[PDB]
Design a protein around this ligand. Structure first.
Ligand SMILES: [K+]
Ligand SMILES: [K+]
Ligand SMILES: [K+]
Ligand SMILES: [K+]
Ligand SMILES: [K+]
Ligand SMILES: [K+]
Ligand SMILES: [K+]
Ligand SMILES: [K+]
Ligand SMILES: [K+]
Ligand SMILES: [Mg+2]
Ligand SMILES: [Mg+2]
Ligand SMILES: [Mg+2]
Ligand SMILES: [Mg+2]
Ligand SMILES: [Mg+2]
Ligand SMILES: [Mg+2]
Ligand SMILES: [Mg+2]
Ligand SMILES: [Mg+2]
Ligand SMILES: [Mg+2]
Ligand SMILES: [Mg+2]
Ligand SMILES: [Mg+2]
Ligand SMILES: [Mg+2]
Ligand SMILES: [Mg+2]
Ligand SMILES: [Mg+2]
Lengths: 206, 99, 100, 117, 129, 84, 153
RNA sequence: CUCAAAGGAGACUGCCAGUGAUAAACUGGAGGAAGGUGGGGAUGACGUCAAGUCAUCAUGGCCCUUACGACCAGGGCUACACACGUGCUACAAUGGCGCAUACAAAGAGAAGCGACCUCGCGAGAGCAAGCGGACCUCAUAAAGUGCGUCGUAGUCCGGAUUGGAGUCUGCAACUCGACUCCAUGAAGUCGGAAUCGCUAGUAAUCGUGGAUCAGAAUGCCACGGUGAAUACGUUCCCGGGCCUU
């Protein structure tokens, strides 16, 4: 059957929120819309920067955006030129003074969003889906995840009949609430249509 | 006397803010009554989870707004100015009243 | 929703904002108990002259990311589907799965 | 026990007995009794003629029985021969106040009429 | 038997504060007499039951304030609070009170309404076709 | 219905049309799409072609039509019975 | 049920007399959870019965229950072939439950003015071995007697 | 002290007895607020039905491009010989009506909730506090209880339908809104074959709130009050699990 979202079910237990601000009903929707626009622009702009997570905070009449990246040098540029440009655009979009922080994602092979994006890029480059998933699982297991599962669904290899294929190593205990499960998805737009990728990575119980 | 009203979606964050407020208020001479835990507000939402039909398949969500009250009675001059510059953490709403 | 359907809503919001007060004072004149019997008639006739799209009752709440005119939620400004997606991704502060 | 050309029950309270007149409900009956100065819980059997005659003119103050029936028939006939939407609804026997006709509407349509072949 | 003894009683959404002291048998609930407050004979019996069990009905004076719930819930909460007050007064009555079953707090509450059901458990009428 | 304190409603364009028609001898039908306008005691005698959705049907305004809306005399749905 | 895990639920005794028997009777008579209304009806009927007879309310009620209580009923038993109506002994608790239910149903079926009056008339008829619920006990006993030959299944 | 909300304690077959293969475990007892998964929720394995959704969105391919795109007014989605599903209100006296009088929980509010006072039979209107709220408003809980009446009648049951007169929202209540007043007062007197839900604070019954929303719930989601009956048992009906043939 259908499964609960692994991040959503853990949002108050072992996982943190991606947006941390307080608002009343008067500006809640406006803040949500501005966050959506900011994340949209940042994701579109930093497509090749290996961005895994965009955290947004609103301390007081200002916006602070933390970008978790595996290529901080590419994100920042020479003496902060690119990050300054992004700060300007984010301030323009949000209508408030903006402050951009860069967080380091060491070991990108252990980050669910980055793994899914890598598999998706390979699929769009017409790499064998089996090879892509096996490589991702092997890399994560070698780096030391307690478990990983990768699932790819759609017209794999351009087949007329779509199907779902998944691989798993170690343990991925989705029913354990206190389990550190990093889960994320991605989509590849191939000439035969859309292929969906889901990645679960287990990092031990807290 | 002045009233400090603290709103937060996270009770740990609100507890940290109240602890630092009462510390920085008691250090500067003025005494503090509280902190007082006001009743938590629980806003609830129910949504249909299927894109089409299946009326009985729903997700129920809630937002918990925690509320704290801080009394500062007999505020000194060095007490008053030692409050707005504290710059509490994000996600905490602070309302100041001159009661 | 369609692009034209979204443009209709933005135009309606703009017209309502533009003609806000010019409607309010006419309605006050019409609803005035101690008003005369001919200035009331003139105000009633003038209220119809304004474009229909300037009335706030012509606006339909739509999802701010898709344009969906059904299943809207005011607290978030989104339809139920998008609210669920954002909540699961963790993008709605303080919102989690409830149980009591 | 004879008001407005009809006979009212004698074993009932005055307020209940007065409603038997077409055009008199509970509220109008209460108003008439208050105007006449008669209690509501007294049976009209134990009422002297000097109270029935004071009820009669109070009843005559209103439009009841044949006059009311003629007025209602006249208004409905006016709708029908005007031929407005309400008049057409009255002509066809369908509900006139915008109720659903896909189902229900049995009060206006009578009992069900099965289709013939 | 020289100072006030206190008990807390709870039943459904009712909470009752009971103050007990030596006396002659006068009971006040929310600044009213027992018969003035509880018009139900069942509620009166529920209130009186611990005193009848312990044979100390006319040796004590009862001062009780209650809020929440309804008549039966308030009576049960009062009974629980009276039992606790008597236990605070004398600790040898715990065995007999537990044997009578008054020490137990009745935890039965209203079951929540659930999605897809008309009530806590009543389902909508089913039809095969 | 419409509150008494607001007075009966009438569309301004139709009011102008009937004002221009009553003073003249114009007996041509007054074509209109305004079924929401109340019939006023100033256009008894001339014919108004009210829209019903797909055409304009002419109603001859009489005294007894005062107080009704123009659409009350222009039915919108065509019905002739089932299997009749 | 299959698992045999059902205990017993204690019932508070009735206010006026402290009889769980009468409390169960009130529970059976009660509709829509209106226990105070049921208690008032039962008390009025019991006082009418007590003033009609020479015994107390409890004694008259016990006489009526003794006259209405069945001893053997018939239950269906399906074996290889056809189903038989086997006579089975009724346990005392079910005897009381059936007697009360039959009395309440007969009183509801009666056509007097008030429910308390109907219940009093039904109780008096039961004490004199007349009327419904007594005819019902008789019918049950007759069926058991007619099917006595099957009292080994 | 009730309570508000943070941090802790508590329940673990922990102890006792018996049974059991020196086991797992079961039966009962003590203590305790709670006893054996304490109650309820969340949580849905590998998969199945080419199950649903190209009309939330996204997307391969196909198709239209002075039109299958775009704007507007009016109408329709509310039709009506009929058939089915899901509900509401009843058929009454365990009740209707009148007067008096108690006892809840949960929640919402700024183009918002709107008190007091006055006017109106009423829906409401005028004026105008307080409240971004444990403070103010929505907001009187109802069933209940006491007294009186109705006295088994298609009724003082029932309130459908229709005539007349109004209120409010809204440019605008004809098609096609909700509510109020006066009058009108239909079927219906417990429902064929058949069929549904429920094992305890459940069913039944009684009110209250919220989302949507200018206005427009008998639907949906949620909250308390009162508060049952019965379960001997697994032969039979339905679905399912394990071994075997
Ligand atoms: K139907
Ligand atoms: K497509
Ligand atoms: K329309
Ligand atoms: K209709
Ligand atoms: K319904
Ligand atoms: K039905
Ligand atoms: K009647
Ligand atoms: K309408
Ligand atoms: K088999
Ligand atoms: Mg589109
Ligand atoms: Mg609208
Ligand atoms: Mg009459
Ligand atoms: Mg309930
Ligand atoms: Mg179905
Ligand atoms: Mg589990
Ligand atoms: Mg299919
Ligand atoms: Mg289909
Ligand atoms: Mg249009
Ligand atoms: Mg439809
Ligand atoms: Mg009636
Ligand atoms: Mg069960
Ligand atoms: Mg609304
Ligand atoms: Mg098994």
């Amino acid at each position: 059957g259908q499964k609960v979202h692994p991040n959503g079910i853990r949002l108050g237990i072992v996982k943190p929120w991606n947006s941390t601000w307080f608002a009343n009903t008067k500006e809640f929707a406006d803040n949500l819309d501005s966050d959506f626009k900011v994340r949209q622009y940042l994701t579109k702009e930093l497509a090749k920067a290996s961005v895994s997570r965009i955290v947004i905070e609103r301390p007081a009449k200002s916006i602070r955006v933390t970008i978790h990246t595996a290529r901080p040098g590419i994100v920042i540029g020479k003496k902060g030129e690119d990050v300054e440009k992004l700060r300007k655009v984010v301030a323009d979009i949000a209508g408030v003074p903006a402050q951009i922080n860069i967080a380091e994602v060491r070991k990108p092979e252990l980050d669910a969003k980055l793994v899914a994006d890598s598999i998706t890029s390979q699929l769009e480059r017409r790499v064998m889906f089996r090879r892509a998933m096996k490589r991702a699982v092997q890399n994560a297991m070698r780096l030391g995840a307690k478990g990983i599962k990768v699932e790819v669904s759609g017209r794999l290899g351009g087949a007329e009949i779509a199907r779902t294929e998944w691989y798993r190593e170690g343990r991925v205990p989705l029913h354990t609430l206190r389990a550190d499960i990093d889960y994320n998805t991605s989509e590849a737009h191939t000439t035969y249509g859309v292929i969906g990728v889901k990645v679960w990575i287990f990092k031990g119980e807290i | 006397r002045i009233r400090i009203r603290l709103k937060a979606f996270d009770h740990r964050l609100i507890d940290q803010a109240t602890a630092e407020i009462v510390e920085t208020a008691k250090r500067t001479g003025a005494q503090v009554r509280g902190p007082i835990p006001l009743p938590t507000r629980k806003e609830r939402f129910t949504v249909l989870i299927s894109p089409h039909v299946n009326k009985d398949a729903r997700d129920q969500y809630e937002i918990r707004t925690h509320l704290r009250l801080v009394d500062i009675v007999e505020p000194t001059e060095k007490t008053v100015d030692a409050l707005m510059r504290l710059d509490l953490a994000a996600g905490v709403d602070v309302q100041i009243s001159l009661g | 929703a369609k692009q034209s359907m979204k443009a209709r809503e933005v135009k309606r919001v703009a017209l309502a904002d533009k003609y806000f007060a010019k409607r309010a004072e006419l309605k006050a004149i019409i609803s005035d108990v101690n008003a005369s019997d001919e200035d009331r008639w003139n105000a009633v006739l003038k209220l119809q002259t304004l474009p229909r799209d300037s009335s706030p009752s012509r606006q339909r709440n739509r999802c701010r990311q898709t344009g969906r005119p059904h299943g809207f939620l005011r607290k978030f400004g989104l339809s139920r589907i998008k609210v669920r997606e954002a909540a699961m991704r963790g993008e709605i502060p303080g919102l989690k799965k409830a149980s009591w | 026990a004879r008001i407005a050309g009809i006979n009212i029950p004698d074993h009932k309270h005055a307020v209940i007995a007065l409603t038997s007149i077409y055009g008199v409900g509970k509220t109008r009956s209460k108003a008439i009794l208050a105007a006449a100065g008669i209690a509501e819980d007294v049976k009209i059997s134990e009422l002297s003629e000097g109270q029935i005659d004071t009820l009669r003119d109070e009843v005559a103050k209103f439009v009841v029985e044949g006059d009311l029936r003629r007025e209602i028939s006249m208004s409905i006939k006016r709708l029908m021969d005007l031929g407005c939407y309400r008049g057409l609804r009255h002509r066809r026997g369908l509900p006139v106040r915008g109720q659903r006709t896909k189902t229900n509407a049995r009060t206006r349509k009578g009992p069900r009429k099965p289709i013939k072949k | 038997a020289e100072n006030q003894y206190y008990g807390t009683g709870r039943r459904k959404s009712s909470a009752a504060r009971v103050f007990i002291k030596p006396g002659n048998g006068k009971i006040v609930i929310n600044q009213r007499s027992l018969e003035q407050y509880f018009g139900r004979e069942t509620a009166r019996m529920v209130v009186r039951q611990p005193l009848e069990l312990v044979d100390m009905v006319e040796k004590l004076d009862l001062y009780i304030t209650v809020k929440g719930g309804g008549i039966s819930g308030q009576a049960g909460a009062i009974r629980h609070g009276i039992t606790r007050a008597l236990m605070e007064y004398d600790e040898s009555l715990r065995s007999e009170l537990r044997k009578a079953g008054f020490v137990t707090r009745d935890a039965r509450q209203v079951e929540r309404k659930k999605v897809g059901l008309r009530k806590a458990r009543r389902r909508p009428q089913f039809s095969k076709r | 219905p419409r509150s008494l304190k607001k007075g009966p409603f009438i569309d301004l364009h139709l009011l102008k049309k009937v004002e221009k028609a009553v003073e003249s001898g114009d007996k041509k039908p007054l074509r209109t799409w305004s079924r929401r306008s109340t019939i006023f005691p100033n256009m008894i005698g001339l014919t108004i072609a009210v829209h019903n959705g797909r055409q304009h049907v002419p109603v001859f305004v009489t005294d007894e039509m005062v107080g009704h809306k123009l659409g009350e005399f222009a039915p919108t749905r065509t019905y002739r019975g089932h299997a009749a | 049920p299959r698992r045999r895990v059902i205990g017993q639920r204690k019932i508070l005794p009735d206010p006026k007399f402290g009889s769980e028997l009468l409390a169960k009777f009130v529970n059976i008579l009660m509709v829509d959870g209106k226990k105070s209304t049921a208690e008032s009806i039962v008390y009025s009927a019991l006082e009418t019965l007590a003033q009609r007879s020479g015994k107390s309310e409890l004694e008259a009620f016990e006489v009526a229950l003794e006259n209405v209580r069945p001893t053997v009923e018939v239950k269906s038993r399906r074996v290889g072939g056809s189903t038989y109506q086997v006579p089975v002994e009724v346990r005392p608790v079910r005897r009381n439950a059936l007697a009360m239910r039959w009395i309440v149903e007969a009183a509801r079926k009666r056509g007097d003015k008030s429910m308390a009056l109907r219940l009093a008339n039904e109780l008096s008829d039961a004490a004199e071995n007349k009327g419904t619920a007594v005819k019902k006990r008789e019918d049950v006993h007759r069926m058991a007697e007619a099917n006595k030959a099957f009292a080994h299944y």
